[PDB]
């Protein structure tokens, strides 16, 4: 089922987390990498993602699976470039990773790259998966 | 909603009938194609499909919603396989169709191909639907 998509996204070894989340009706995680962050995304966090406030999360970022993130570019609700780019808030600790959230008709494809992995590479991977999903009526 | 599985299963046009039957406790059709055969499957018939005694299959087949079928292969109760290939029985030069029945924890998935669709194609669609369900603990 949806498990194949997560395996597909993680296959090249450049990412550490991935998830496909339904946001219509009742937000639910359809498949996510086990023991990680995205598997714990909540309906409230999803609500913020597809929300009306597109600039409030610019000073104060947001949270995905509890993880605080900094929005570095928001184009989630934009015609064409239906993506959002974020970084993992290294408020404490040290390692920061690039995340990309892409949106389709019924889902939100989330990808988190490993340390050092170029952001645009995460954007490419996340964006192409969603492009495949939307053309497949999803 | 279970009817969405029916729509999904019926989308490519290869099938003419489909159903998701709950066999545990009190057996019933959770979803089927209105105006077709599977929708009329009885608890007695469901009992025949999941009983441990497979005697009648090899005696003279079995019926699905009244429709008599011949058992090509019965591995329904067999672990790791959980599938049974059938073929409708006809009178006159009326066509015969491939039917596959797969089982999960709480469900029986039924599919009847249209004339000319190979049994192997029917078996894959069904098995794939059954693997998805069992992954969701169904």
């Amino acid at each position: 089922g949806w498990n194949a998509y997560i395996d597909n996204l993680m296959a090249d070894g450049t990412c550490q987390d991935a998830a496909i989340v339904g946001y219509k009706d009742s937000p639910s995680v359809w498949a996510a990498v086990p023991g990680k962050t995205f598997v714990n995304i909540t309906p409230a966090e999803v609500g913020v993602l597809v929300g009306k406030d597109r600039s409030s999360f610019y000073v104060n970022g947001l949270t995905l699976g509890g993880q605080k993130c900094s929005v570095i570019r928001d184009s989630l609700l934009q015609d064409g470039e239906f993506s959002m780019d974020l970084r993992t808030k290294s408020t404490g600790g040290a390692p920061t990773f690039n995340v990309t959230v892409t949106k389709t008709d019924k889902t939100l494809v989330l990808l988190m790259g490993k340390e050092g992995v170029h952001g645009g590479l995460i954007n490419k991977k996340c964006y192409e998966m969603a492009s495949h999903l939307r053309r497949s009526q999803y | 909603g279970w009817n969405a599985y029916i729509d999904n299963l019926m989308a490519d046009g290869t099938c003419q009938d489909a159903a998701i039957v709950g066999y545990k406790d009190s057996p019933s059709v959770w979803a089927a194609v209105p105006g077709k055969t599977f929708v009329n499957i009885t608890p007695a018939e469901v009992g025949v499909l999941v009983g441990k005694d497979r005697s009648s299959f090899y005696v003279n087949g079995l019926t699905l919603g009244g429709q008599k079928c011949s058992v090509i292969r019965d591995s329904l109760l067999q672990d790791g396989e959980f599938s049974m290939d059938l073929r409708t029985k006809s009178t006159g030069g009326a066509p015969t169709f491939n039917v596959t029945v797969t089982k999960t924890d709480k469900t029986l998935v039924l599919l009847m191909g249209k004339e000319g669709v190979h049994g192997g194609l029917i078996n894959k669609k069904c098995y794939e639907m059954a693997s998805h369900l069992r992954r969701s603990q169904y």
Binding site: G1, W2, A4, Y5, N8, G22, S28, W30, H132, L133, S136, Q137, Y138 | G1, W2, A4, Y5, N8, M129, H132, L133, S136, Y138
Partner: peptide, 10 residues
């Protein structure tokens, strides 16, 4: 690039 999977149960 697999085909879209079934939706989640119920």
């Amino acid at each position: 690039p697999p085909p879209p999977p079934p939706p989640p149960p119920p």
